[PDB]
Structure formats: structure tokens, C-alpha cells
Motif scaffolding. Structure first.
Motif, short mmCIF file in Angstrom:
data_model
loop_
_atom_site.label_atom_id
_atom_site.label_comp_id
_atom_site.label_asym_id
_atom_site.label_seq_id
_atom_site.Cartn_x
_atom_site.Cartn_y
_atom_site.Cartn_z
N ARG A 73 60.31 48.50 72.42
CA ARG A 73 60.58 48.89 73.80
C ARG A 73 62.03 48.61 74.18
O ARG A 73 62.62 49.32 75.00
CB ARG A 73 59.63 48.16 74.75
N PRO A 77 63.66 52.66 74.89
CA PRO A 77 62.98 52.54 76.18
C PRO A 77 61.87 53.58 76.27
O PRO A 77 60.73 53.25 76.60
CB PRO A 77 64.07 52.90 77.18
N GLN A 98 54.53 43.75 78.94
CA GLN A 98 55.37 44.76 79.58
C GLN A 98 55.67 45.96 78.70
O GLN A 98 56.80 46.45 78.66
CB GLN A 98 56.67 44.13 80.07
N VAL A 99 54.66 46.44 77.98
CA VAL A 99 54.83 47.61 77.14
C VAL A 99 54.11 48.81 77.72
O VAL A 99 52.94 48.73 78.10
CB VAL A 99 54.35 47.34 75.70
N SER A 100 54.82 49.93 77.80
CA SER A 100 54.23 51.18 78.26
C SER A 100 53.28 51.72 77.19
O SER A 100 53.55 52.74 76.55
CB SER A 100 55.31 52.19 78.62
#
Lengths: 129, 127
Positions: A73, A77, A98-100
Motif C-alpha cells: 500500500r 497507493p 489500513q489496507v484497501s
């Protein structure tokens, strides 16, 4: 396209590679993958994108895929992360790191939906291109 | 950095609201935002951030299909869900939406406030 995979279990890393060949050929779209269970070798493919299949409980270390997921990430991004694991209760935990996380797919499930939930993770990507 | 909020409930769309100002000040960060309770005008703002609720106006799973819309027009974007629906946490994956977080809103204001910083500081780090 091109895929990066993190699975230190051969049985579990060969199941996937078969699915990818079925889908690519059933969908008539190319697919190229690299596979390993060696973390530092994986990062060699980021040290010097786009779809990432990550295991979590790696090498006695649970929540390792989470760590590498952060790393990915950082470098990209707008990269796509898909989590594959036998650890059910981590479905909640993807948010913490906090990973999409596009997807979180359990591996202890029947072969048929298994192949399906991957196509989704790929129909997503082709559309995103 | 601009923020977009989607809450139909007043006493909950101001809880988060005041927090934004605190953080904006406490960490000295410019935070602009506009909030609405209706979905229809939310689309205007599109067609940085998102704080969609889910069980919006008597109908659950609505905030999901809205984020799905944002994702199409804005693939780059950061998405945060905030609900009392603590059972929809496993669902987010289904709607092809790469959300950043999922906040059970029915928590204390201490931990609640904290949770929003992560998302904001994430964006701060991403710019």
C-alpha cells in the motif's frame, strides 16, 4: 495482465494457480503470475502492481500478510489487495492495518464458489483498465 | 482536504462533525466538508474523503450501493463506513468496494474520536 501471490503452502498455492488458468482460458483473457512463500523475494517484486493475493498467517507468524499489505500500500497507493486465508476471524481485522482490501476470501470452502469469487476480483480489474 | 459525509441522522452527523473540527485544530489541519442526509444531492458533488452511513433512511445496505457509485466515478477515493449495523462488516468485500474502515458508531466518544484520526492521518499521509 499480471498477478503477484504470497502463499507458503504448496497445496494452497497450486489450487489457486489452477483456478487462474481455468478463468483466463474460460474468459479468453491472458494472465501471468509469480508465486512464492518467501517474503523478501516477494518484496523484490516491489523493491526495484497490480492484483495481489495475500495469505496472512505466514511462517508461524499470523498477521504477516497484513504487514506486507501495508508495505504494498505504501509503494503503490492504488494497488489491488485480495486476502486469501484459512483464518476466518481476520475478516474484521483488515481495517486495522489500513489496507484497501478489495476482497477477503476464505480457503476452507467449496471449490465452485472459490473459482467464482476470483473472477469477480478479475472482472473488477479488467474494468479498471 | 475536503470531506464528504452521508448521514441521515442529526444527532449522529454532528457527533462526527465536531470531532472533525477538533482534529482539524488539535493537529492544525485544514478540514473542509459538506454533509447531507439525502442521497440524490450527494451525487451532484461527484458526477478526498467519504463517511457513508449504511442503513440510510429506513432502508439498510443503501450506503453500500452509494459507495459503489463513488468507486466507479472515483476509483482513487478513500471510503469510510459508520453504522450501528455491526453485522455488515463482513459484507463490504462483496460490493466490490475497497473501503478503508468500518466504524461501529455505537461506541464511546473517546474510542470513536480516535478511530477517525486514523482515516484522516491516512489521507494526510497519502497526499
Amino acid at each position: 495482465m499480471k498477478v503477484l501471490i504470497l502463499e507458503d503452502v504448496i497445496e494452497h498455492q497450486v489450487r489457486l494457480e489452477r483456478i487462474l488458468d481455468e478463468i483466463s482460458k474460460e474468459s479468453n483473457i491472458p494472465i501471468s503470475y509469480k508465486t512464492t512463500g518467501k517474503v523478501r523475494e516477494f518484496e523484490e517484486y516491489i523493491e526495484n502492481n497490480q492484483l495481489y493475493f495475500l495469505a496472512i498467517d505466514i511462517h508461524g507468524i499470523e498477521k504477516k500478510g497484513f504487514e506486507v499489505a501495508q508495505l504494498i500500500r505504501h509503494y503503490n497507493p492504488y494497488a489491488i489487495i485480495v486476502f486469501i486465508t484459512s483464518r476466518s476471524e481476520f475478516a474484521t481485522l483488515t481495517y486495522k492495518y489500513q489496507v484497501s482490501a478489495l476482497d477477503f476470501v476464505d480457503k476452507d470452502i467449496n471449490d465452485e464458489m472459490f473459482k467464482k469469487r476470483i473472477e469477480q476480483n478479475i472482472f473488477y480489474t479488467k474494468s479498471m483498465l
